[PDB]
């Protein structure tokens, strides 16, 4: 239930809320919702074992 | 009306600072579904 961003664009200033995200394009591959190569979601859950 | 934003998109972030001749100086959190809330005094 707790999400953190693995990677992003250029870094933040103090005190941003950036809850809106869709996808990152790591190449010329047009995934746009596919978990295949050169495309991944930024949000990924901790697990907290 | 002073609609702000970073891309002016439904998915991303936006603001809808509005003003009038009355106490409706409301600064809403995130309104994006309205394309143009113009003068609607009817």
B19 CB near a chain A CB, below 8 Å? no
DSSP A3-17: EEES--SSPP-SS--
A20 CB near a chain B CB, below 8 Å? yes
Residue of A nearest to B9 (CA): A20
Experiment type: cryo-EM
Residues of B in contact with A20 (CB under 8 A): 11-13
- Is-contact A9 A30, C-beta < 8 A? no
- Nearby residues of B40 by Cβ (< 8 Å), 6 or more positions away: none
For residue B14, count other CB atoms closer than 10 A to its CB. 19
- What does the alpha-carbon distance between residue B29 and residue B27 come to, in Å, rounded to a whole number? 7
- Is-contact B17 B31, C-beta < 8 A? no
- Is-contact B1 B18, C-beta < 8 A? yes
A16 CB near a chain B CB, below 8 Å? no
The data reach a resolution, in angstroms, of: 3.3
């Amino acid at each position: 239930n707790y999400l953190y961003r693995l990677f992003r664009k250029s870094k933040l200033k103090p005190f941003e809320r950036d809850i809106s995200t869709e996808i990152y394009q790591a190449g010329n591959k047009p995934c746009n919702g596919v978990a295949g190569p050169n495309c991944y979601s930024p949000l990924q859950s901790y697990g907290f074992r | 009306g002073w609609i702000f934003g970073t891309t002016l998109d439904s998915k991303t972030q936006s603001l809808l600072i509005v003003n009038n001749a009355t106490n409706v100086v409301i600064k809403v959190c995130e309104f994006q579904f309205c394309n143009d809330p113009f003068l609607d005094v009817y």
